């Protein structure tokens, strides 16, 4: 596991000049320009940071084609051949448009997923590594924590890139297919019988792949929009405290307290209430106990006072705020009580939580012995027959 483990190449400038040289008069000059008009788009782009760098090339294609179609329209059985060509160009532009849309949406999703959530953890990681580099020119525990946190960020970053690439493949594939169909029908190539068969194929597919498409969509919303947890977070699902090992579109992989690896479908996880200790504020806890009904109220008062002193001597573990609650009188034999305390940590480090609680439980033991707090069973009257 990742967590829990024990020459032509640069001839474009020249090519562009050669293309310009192609005409100096007349009507076909725009058509000729199209052959190397990409250079013009590149220059326009130069003339025109995450989105900018990632999208400029998609924009260039879109506008490039737009111009080619516009000049084509204004340029002019060759009669039917040209109708065909015109529509082919239109289809190509539609394709580029959709391409641009697709790219944009994935860039938004991919970026906002992390940029608006853990920017600050990245900066903390950089800081500590700068410090380690400087130092090189409980210390060891600190050093290990710094490396483990960096690894966690690397894993989150890689899983996001992977998930986005998977989305990219699904969308690209459907986009390509629909563009083929669009081309065939707008150009007039497909005939009536072909339209009928394509129509049927789509309808049938709509049923077959219906649940699949819905499931993927819901999984995307769960993972990227709701985002109840990240990689490495300790989460609670139906009472199971589990560490998130990996996130994917269809599944989330978790490690149980005993490090069993669990594959948990997102289509199910989407309907559950999910806890997240990593994202929690300092967490609290409870120690329940019972005392005899005859315990003097003064000993109850001494118990409260002794507990307060303990907690105040250990402020690295406990917040000063606590409550002692008397809850119930059972028969006239038992008083049920509970101690409510506040930890100075959240429970991402579960073992540390238990160690601190364990000491508090032993302190309670000690206080009861010193104050002579006891619990007795009710007496039983016996009658003897011979
Ligand atoms: C149902 C159509 C495909 C869905 C999109 C591609 C896969 C999305 C990611 C899900 C996890 C599959 C890849 C990891 C498999 C493994 O554990 O080796």
Numbering used by the authors: 96 to 101, 186 to 204, 222 to 244, 258 to 285, 294 to 354, 503 to 751
Q: From the publication, what sentences describe this entry?
A:
Flycatcher1 (FLYC1), a MscS homolog, has recently been identified as a candidate mechanosensitive (MS) ion channel involved in Venus flytrap prey recognition. FLYC1 is an ortholog of prokaryotic MS ion channel MscS (mechanosensitive ion channel of small conductance), which functions as an osmotic release valve, and is perhaps the most extensively studied MS channel. FLYC1 comprises a homoheptamer with six TMs (TM1–TM6) per protomer and intracellular N and C termini. A glycine-containing hinge (G575) splits TM6 into two halves (TM6a and TM6b), and the β-rich C-termini of the FLYC1 protomers come together to form a hollow cytoplasmic cage.
A striking difference between the classes is the conformation of the cytosolic TM4-TM5 linker, which can be in an up or down conformation. In the up conformation, the TM4-TM5 linker is parallel to the membrane plane, while in the down conformation, the linker swivels towards the cytosol. TM1-TM5 are displaced in a clockwise manner in the down state compared to the up state when viewed from the extracellular side. In the down state, a short six-residue coil (P96-S101) from the N-terminus interacts near the side portals of the cytoplasmic vestibule. Symmetry expansion followed by variability analysis in cryoSPARC40 confirmed the presence of density for this short peptide only in the down conformation. In the down state, R334 shifts upward and does not contact D598. TM6a hinges away from the pore center in the down state, which displaces F572 outward. Therefore, the distinct TM6 conformations in up and down states could represent different functional states. 3D EM variability analysis displayed a lipid-like density at the top of the pore, which differs from the ‘hook’ and pore lipids of EcMscS, as it is not on the outer side of TM6a or in the middle of the pore, respectively, but rather it intercalates in-between adjacent TM6a helices. This density is associated with the down class, but it only appears when the adjacent subunit (clockwise when viewed from extracellular side) is positioned far enough to create a side opening to the membrane.
